[PDB]
Write a protein that binds this ligand. Structure first.
Ligand SMILES: Nc1nc2c(ncn2[C@@H]2O[C@H](COP(=O)(O)OP(=O)(O)NP(=O)(O)O)[C@@H](O)[C@H]2O)c(=O)[nH]1
Ligand SMILES: [Mg+2]
Length: 166
């Protein structure tokens, strides 16, 4: 079966691990905090085509990891995750995307912008329109707001990222 190597990236605390585990295992991590940059596997069907996904849950950008350029070079698609409750995590993604494009030496990289923690509407600081315009600035319409906690758009992040690699 075709296998896709996906990479979830973003600043600390945005819910990279929570999204990955919710998608792959169907459970919410609550306060459990994985300390390994591990890979998580799930078979999916997207547009009537079967795919094995292997999803790498990376450390927050501000944390040490010597493997970063390896994952940026080798990953087939990237989920760039921020929290809607922290503008810094959103702005951080501009530099992050630039780093990925630099490592790959091309603009043509499957990517989805993900505003996580959308269940925290009362704590929102990043407007949905901000996310939409960032996507527009990137010339890539793939943008979702998600909640790992409430299971909103979690599967769709990965399905939509697969659509781009296909
Ligand atoms: N309300 C809410 N909380 C969330 C969501 N996702 C994650 N969290 C919470 O946010 C905290 C950090 O989540 P986690 O998945 O560990 O984030 P991370 O991006 O993997 N952090 P790190 O970069 O350090 O590995 C946890 O308390 C977690 O329960 C969400 O969609 N909604
Ligand atoms: Mg994590």
């Amino acid at each position: 079966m075709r296998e896709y190597k996906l990479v979830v990236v973003g600043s600390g605390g945005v819910g990279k691990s929570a999204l990955t585990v919710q998608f792959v295992q169907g459970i919410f991590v609550e306060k459990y905090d994985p300390t390994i940059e591990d890979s998580y596997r799930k078979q999916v069907e997207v547009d009537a085509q079967q795919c094995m996904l292997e999803i790498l849950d990376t450390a927050g950008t501000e944390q040490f990891t010597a493997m970063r350029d390896l994952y940026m070079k080798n990953g087939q698609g990237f989920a760039l995750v921020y929290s809607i409750t922290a503008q810094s995590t959103f702005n951080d993604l501009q530099d992050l995307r630039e780093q990925i494009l630099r490592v790959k030496d091309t603009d043509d990289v499957p990517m989805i912008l993900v505003g996580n923690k959308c269940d925290l509407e009362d704590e929102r600081v990043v407007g949905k329109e901000q996310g939409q315009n960032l996507a527009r600035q990137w010339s890539n319409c793939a943008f979702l707001e998600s909640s790992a906690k409430s299971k909103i758009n979690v599967n769709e992040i990965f399905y939509d990222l697969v659509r781009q690699i296909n």
